[PDB]
Design a protein around this ligand. Structure first.
Ligand SMILES: O=P(O)(O)OCC1O[C@@H](O)[C@H](O)[C@@H]1O
Ligand SMILES: [Mg+2]
Ligand SMILES: [Mg+2]
Length: 292
C-alpha cells in the first residue's frame, strides 16, 4: 500500500518544471480521474535525439514494439506487461503528474544494471569477523561515492544500446570500481580473467524491475537488475585493487549493516543480499529499551 514517492517530487531533475499534484488515492491508473492534467516535459537533451534516445511518438517512421525486444532496444519490463494508452507506455506504478520522457531516452522502461560485488570482511590473518549482536559474519560490498552528489552507491549504470545486462554489469563495475578504462593495458586481461571467474561463478539476482526514481514520468521510468557476485574465499577479489573511475570520487569496500545510507534504492538491495548470504545486519537490538 505504498505509492511511488520519488517519482512525484518536484521540480523534475535538472529543470524547474513542477509536476502536477497527484493525491495518493489517485496514483493507481485503475482509479478514474477525468480531470487528471499532467504537465508535459521531455528534456532538450532527449528531444535533440542522441543515439541513446527514442524519436518522439509522432515521428512518422517511428514504430516501437513495446513489451518486447525491439532490435537493439529491450522494451520488455521486468515487472511484466505495461499498458499502452494514447500510443505510449503507462508507468506500471501509476500516475506521476508529468507526461513525456523527462531526462529518459526511451519510452517505457529505461534499463540499468547494478553489480553488487561482495566478500566477507577479514582481519589481518585473513579470517572472517563475527558480529556479537547477530552472531553472523560481517559482509562488505564494493561501493563508489558519486561525483555529482557524493552519495555512496552500487557502481551501476545504464544498459547501453544493444548491450547485454551481463555486459553492463561487468563493464560498469570494472570501469568505475577498478578504473579499467585507464589500467596498464594487458593488465586489463587479468581484470578480465578475475572478473571472468567472478562473474562466471553462480550469482544471485537480487532485484529486477521498477525503481522509484525522480526521473520517472507517466510514460518512461527506470528499471534495474541488481545482481550479486560473491567471493566466498576472498581469493578472487583478494589481489584486485579498487580504483575509482572518472565518474566516481571514491571507491572502497563498505561494511554491510542496517545503518548504511546509500543512493537511490541501493540499501534495499543490500539488505536482501545480507539476507541471502546469512550476513550480519542488525547493529542495535534496542535491548536498552527493554532491559532494566
Ligand atoms: O545513476 P545512473 O547511472 O544515472 O542510473 C542508473 C541506476 O539508478 C537507479 O535507479 C538504479 O539502481 C541504477 O543504479
Ligand atoms: Mg554509467
Ligand atoms: Mg552510473
Amino acid at each position: 500500500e505504498n505509492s511511488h514517492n520519488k517519482a512525484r517530487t518536484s521540480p523534475y531533475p535538472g529543470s524547474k518544471v513542477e509536476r502536477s499534484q497527484v493525491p495518493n488515492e489517485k496514483v493507481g491508473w485503475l482509479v478514474e480521474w477525468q480531470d487528471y492534467k499532467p504537465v508535459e516535459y521531455t528534456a532538450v537533451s532527449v528531444l535533440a535525439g542522441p543515439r541513446w534516445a527514442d524519436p518522439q511518438i509522432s515521428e512518422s517512421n517511428f514504430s516501437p514494439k513495446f513489451n518486447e525486444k525491439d532490435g537493439h532496444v529491450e522494451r520488455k519490463s521486468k515487472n511484466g506487461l505495461y499498458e499502452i494508452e494514447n500510443g505510449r507506455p503507462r508507468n506500471p506504478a501509476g500516475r506521476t503528474g508529468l507526461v513525456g520522457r523527462g531526462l529518459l531516452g526511451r519510452w517505457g522502461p529505461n534499463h540499468a544494471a547494478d553489480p553488487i560485488i561482495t566478500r566477507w570482511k577479514r582481519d589481518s590473518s585473513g579470517n572472517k569477523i563475527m558480529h556479537p549482536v547477530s552472531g553472523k559474519h560481517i559482509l562488505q560490498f564494493v561501493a563508489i561515492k558519486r561525483k555529482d552528489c557524493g552519495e555512496w552507491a552500487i557502481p551501476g549504470g545504464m544498459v547501453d544500446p544493444g548491450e547485454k545486462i551481463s555486459a553492463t554489469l561487468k563493464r560498469e563495475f570494472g570501469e568505475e570500481a577498478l578504473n579499467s578504462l585507464q589500467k596498464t593495458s594487458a593488465e586489463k586481461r587479468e581484470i578480465e580473467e578475475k572478473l571472468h571467474k567472478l562473474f562466471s561463478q553462480d550469482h544471485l539476482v537480487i532485484y529486477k524491475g521498477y525503481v522509484d526514481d525522480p526521473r520517472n514520468t507517466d510514460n518512461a521510468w527506470m528499471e534495474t537488475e541488481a545482481v550479486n557476485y560473491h567471493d566466498e574465499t576472498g581469493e578472487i577479489m583478494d589481489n584486485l585493487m579498487l580504483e575509482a573511475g572518472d565518474d566516481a570520487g571514491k571507491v572502497k569496500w563498505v561494511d554491510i549493516n542496517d545503518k548504511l545510507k546509500l543512493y537511490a534504492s541501493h540499501s534495499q538491495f543490500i539488505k536482501l543480499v545480507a539476507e541471502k548470504r546469512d550476513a550480519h545486519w542488525s547493529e542495535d537490538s534496542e535491548a536498552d529499551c527493554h532491559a532494566l
